[model samples]
Target: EYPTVSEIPVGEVRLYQIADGVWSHIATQSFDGAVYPSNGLIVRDGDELLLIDTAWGAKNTAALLAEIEKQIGLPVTRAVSTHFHDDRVGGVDVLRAAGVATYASPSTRRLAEVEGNEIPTHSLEGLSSSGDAVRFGPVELFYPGAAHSTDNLVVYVPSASVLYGGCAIYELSRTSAGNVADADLAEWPTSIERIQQHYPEAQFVIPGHGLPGGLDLLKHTTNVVKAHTNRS
Candidate 1:
């Protein structure tokens, strides 16, 4: 489905469409590299805004915040975490410092609150329910249960027909046979299926680790999962 390479912006907001409704921060670091890139999303709804996934460190988060300011005149009012990993929630403190109210699945918050060290307490705002709709500006937060991690979550932007599948489902291509230690292997495919079933109109998927891709990318991912399952 995704036949073309997505144009990634180097500044704050990595990808955007002046026309239509689409904007995201593509992780620039290679999966094998030291700098793990964390994807971010911004959805414009009239005068309000909805943002999802901040980066790994203070510097990355700061860069994204600056870029967002340049592209949109309004400040980000809401934030969502895809999972509880340090690379995903480490920069949450930055957003909280900016006064953005953060939200994540209860399990994710527990992970951060219990196991995570660098994460600041003030940075997190717990989600009320799974699959609960939280509207900030123009984006909606939807939970597809745990996949990549017990606390994983996804954000759906109906206007753009794009799904932000945090670490839960990186890409259509598995990229490798391994899954994150915290990954929900048995439930991973079913989780993607759930997303597909719920958001049937989704045209594109922006994974947490790779470039944005189309629905066909799932084949690669599913193949990887199947192999892992067979061996396990």
Candidate 2:
């Protein structure tokens, strides 16, 4: 069972220990008077921690970092953004100031540059941005291709059999795809299919905006996409 370990007040950043060394972070942000929560992954390898995505913004990310050290008692040495969205790379500036070796796919970097958002410090060069997993420390990051966003990515931890499907995988409660302004509707379901084939043994699935589930979450996300894709 996922246990709540930390709950920071700044952005309401809540941390849940989902596996041996993996923690799921859900942080909230206010936009147009509504607070939205997004999911992030934190994994421990040896003495250092790897952050999959930052909190909603710099302040929240700063809070998240402080909480990590205060609670988990480890410093985040490296980080990566699954996409260019603020929820993913929002605290890149904070991470940079902290001297964290932050990275993102080249496509994510380019899109961030285009959207005028803070870009990641480094790119996962020569790394497969699409297709199977590319081992990065204890985590494996893969680009499922053209889903919630053109550059959307996913991370999987083999030891824990956990898949972090950041915004690319729709939460079960979502009746429709959230923020499809940057999505490729035609390929959303197809992208999720790739995820299923790649990590068939994924015991836990952490969505970008909701509670954790299992492989059924993968199937649920696929149907959610198809429901919308068919309508459009």
Candidate 3:
């Protein structure tokens, strides 16, 4: 059965309960009467919340926390940026100000610094790279190697069987890899393949910028990357 859905208004941000205990926070931007949305995830573990990625900026990040308290009844204690992109780590400073310990891979931190983005409080370099698992309560941070970004990571909620694929995967609506500005085309497919093989049990796959779906999203991502490669 699908989870009950709800929404909270936080400027251009909207939060949806994509599954039991899993919420998707999508933030939008408007320009010339056009709106675009960016995706993030929040996992409720008891009275604490684990945030995977964050809104596009500090304002939305604050709004996200307020909504979490109103909806999830808990404060965000920890957050992990799946990569260094602005959409993923732009709210790191807000999270830090709210006393949330933020984390990201060393590569992500390094790149974010280069890009002049807020850095996480901790780095995951102590943990083994791709194929290794870093556990936080029932949630797991799995680095299946780079795809969308050189430092991209995915979050796996074992109890929920949901995989937050960040920008490494795409929704069905997208026909091709949306952005390759910071991508490794040669490694994208292999990275996704590693994820597919590593978490075959993930029933719900959430992309960084679109609707959630089943494992077919993984196959779709592979296909999109292949198609892009062929075109190249």
Candidate 4:
């Protein structure tokens, strides 16, 4: 998609968009004595907003919501947790308290409540369709499938051809030897291929971490999966 940028303000929400409908709040975490910065993105439809994976805690959530307020006068209408990871759904309670309805695959919802480190767990589960198209202003959610996590789903904005490929597709440099504990190594190829097929029009692919890349970057995912399978 073509690129554009805008600033958003919703009540106390404050964040900046890399492009028109895309907005993000930068966050930091220090778990187990290691500190790192994380990002949370928001896609605005018309008047409503759809937020993807929340950051680590209440403070992070407050910051994100505050940034959002500066852009849109309304509260977030829908939220999606790309996976069950604590970094992804940690602010679910914050959105729910603001009267927003969060959605995720049934599997992700279940896993978070049982094992996630987040304080307030998600209240919704199990969307009926993939690529079902959840919209806010100019952005949309297209459920590709489990790439990094069992319930991971990717987001695509057709207008700008931007994709939010969560941890399902990590940067090649950030991975280590033991990170595949929960990954379905065998199914990784097809899962990634599915993402490619579904969003054939995407011009830019943004992973959960690292700089955005061309759509051709899908090849990296397939290659990584193959490498993992061969070693196993």
TM-score of each: 0.80, 0.93, 0.91, 0.77
Write candidate 2's Cα lDDT for 148-196 as tens digits: 8988889999999999999887667776767788989888888888998
lDDT of 1 at 188: 75
Please give the range of 10 consecutive residues that has the lowest summed lDDT in model 2: 1-10
- Per-residue accuracy of model 1 over 90-177 as CA lDDT, tens digit each: 6788888888777666667778778743443433343444444554346556666556776677777777788777777666444565
Q: Give the TM-score of candidate 1.
A: 0.80
Model 3 Cα lDDT, one tens digit per residue, 139-182 = 88888877898888889998889899989998887897676999
Candidates 1 and 2 compared by TM-score, better number:
2
lDDT values, one for every candidate: 0.65, 0.84, 0.82, 0.65
For model 2, the superposed segments whose C-alpha errors exceed 4 Å read 1-10, 127-129
Give a tens-digit lDDT track for model 4, residues 1-232.
2121222222123354667767655565666665544555677777778787786666677667775776556577877777778778777788778877776666777777677544334433334344344553465655555556666677787777788787766655544322566677666667777777778888777766544677756787777677767774
> Which model scores highest in TM-score?
2
User: For candidate 4, which ten residues in a row score worst on lDDT?
Assistant: 2-11
Q: Pairing residues by index, what is the TM-score of model 3?
A: 0.91
Q: Clashing residue pairs in candidate 2, if any?
A: none
Q: What is the lDDT of residue 135 in candidate 1?
A: 49
